[PDB]
Amino acid sequence: HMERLLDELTLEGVARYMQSERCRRVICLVGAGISTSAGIPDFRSPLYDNLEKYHLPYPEAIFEISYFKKHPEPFFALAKELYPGQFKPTICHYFMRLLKDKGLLLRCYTQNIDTLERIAGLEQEDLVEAHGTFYTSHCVSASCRHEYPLSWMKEKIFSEVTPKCEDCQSLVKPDIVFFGESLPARFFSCMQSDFLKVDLLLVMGTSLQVQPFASLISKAPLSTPRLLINKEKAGQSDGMIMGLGGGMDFDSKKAYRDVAWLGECDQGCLALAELLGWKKELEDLVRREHASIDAQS
Numbered sequence: 001h002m003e004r005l006l007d008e009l010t011l012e013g014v015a016r017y018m019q020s021e022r023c024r025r026v027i028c029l030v031g032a033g034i035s036t037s038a039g040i041p042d043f044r045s046p047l048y049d050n051l052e053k054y055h056l057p058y059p060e061a062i063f064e065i066s067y068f069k070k071h072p073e074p075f076f077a078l079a080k081e082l083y084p085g086q087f088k089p090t091i092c093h094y095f096m097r098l099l100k101d102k103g104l105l106l107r108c109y110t111q112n113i114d115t116l117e118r119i120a121g122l123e124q125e126d127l128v129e130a131h132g133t134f135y136t137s138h139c140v141s142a143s144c145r146h147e148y149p150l151s152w153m154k155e156k157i158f159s160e161v162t163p164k165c166e167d168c169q170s171l172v173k174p175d176i177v178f179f180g181e182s183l184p185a186r187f188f189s190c191m192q193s194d195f196l197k198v199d200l201l202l203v204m205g206t207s208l209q210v211q212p213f214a215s216l217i218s219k220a221p222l223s224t225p226r227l228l229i230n231k232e233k234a235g236q237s238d239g240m241i242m243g244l245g246g247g248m249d250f251d252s253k254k255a256y257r258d259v260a261w262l263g264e265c266d267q268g269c270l271a272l273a274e275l276l277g278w279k280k281e282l283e284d285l286v287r288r289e290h291a292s293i294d295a296q297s
């Protein structure tokens with residue numbers, strides 16, 4: 001039987017393992033659930049309605065790069081409607097910032113496009129924005145590719161002026177991955193390397209149903225522990241490679257490394273930080289950084 005790095009399948013067992021010498025390199029996989037406490041909805045059933053007024057040939061047209069390029073106005077009107085009114089990263093995001101500053105964070109793979117990871121102080125090298133990001137935008141012409149910052153894009157969105165490139169007048173598109181586009185190059189380079197070197201996988205606020213995350217959990221070594229912090233269980237499996245070839249196993253007789261902590265991401269992170277002796281550091285970090293944002297309003 002495989003080496004069992006967790007002494008028990010609980011948050012407590014994960015924390016003891018994190019403090020042990022073996023655990024040096026943590027990868028986080030994070031989705032829309034880490035940003036809902038920041039006032040950014042995750043598009044469960046509570047988006048389709050906002051679409052009707054745009055008179056699309058079909059609803060999925062809003063996500064299609066092909067359709068964007070000929071009829072960009074629906075997308076930019078939606079982006080206005082959905083633009084967050086403020087950008088205060090959550091307790092969960094700051095938990096990741098603690099991981100960075102303690103030298104524990106190998107990588108944050110995020111499905112979010114809201115930039116809160118960066119606002120919380122994760123740097124480009126810490127991040128794989130698996131679904132791209134609003135943080136930058138580019139002219140869509142292959143020979144130009146001029147880059148625009150978020151301040152530029154925001155103004156176009158709020159002014160309701162379709163963003164055109166100042167060099168060539170082609171459309172300028174936010175660097176988010178529309179259906180039709182390839183995942184960022186950065187995604188492919190990092191993943192190979194990262195996932196051999198990982199000691200702990202921390203999966204927060206994702207149902208693990210969309211790409212690329214849905215593959216990623218099985219790329220960790222087989223002994224690497226995997227903690228999910230989420231409102232509901234996710235990533236569970238119902239071929240040749242047997243133990244290599246499915247998902248989370250939290251509840252079977254054979255479960256040996258995967259743990260599900262059910263509830264709000266912020267609360268789960270606060271609970272883990274508390275076990276680790278980091279609760280005051282985290283609370284102090286959040287207060288200071290939220291204050292720093294509030295002082296600029």
Ligand SMILES: NC(=O)c1ccc[n+]([C@@H]2O[C@H](COP(=O)([O-])OP(=O)(O)OC[C@H]3O[C@@H](n4cnc5c(N)ncnc54)[C@H](O)[C@@H]3O)[C@@H](O)[C@H]2O)c1
Binds near residue numbers: 043205209
């Ligand atoms: N903040 C954002 O950038 C944002 C917001 C909405 C949607 N999206 C896009 O939609 C897709 C969403 O994919 P995903 O896999 O990241 O999310 P998802 O579709 O799996 O939804 C988030 C998951 O977290 C859970 N959840 C919600 N709030 C929670 C909380 N506070 N604590 C714990 N669990 C909570 C939900 O129940 C769900 O399991 C991505 O393409 C993403 O870019 C991004």
Ligand SMILES: Cc1cc(C)nc(SCC(=O)Nc2ncc(Cc3cccc4ccccc34)s2)n1
Binds near residue numbers: 114
């Ligand atoms: C507009 C804005 C700006 C910033 C900085 N942050 C946010 S977070 C809030 C939010 O849900 N917004 C969104 N904008 C566009 C959305 C749908 C969509 C459509 C088409 C392609 C997509 C490609 C990839 C992902 C989504 C795509 S959801 N929103």
Ligand SMILES: [Zn+2]
Binds near residue numbers: 144146165168
């Ligand atoms: Zn251009």
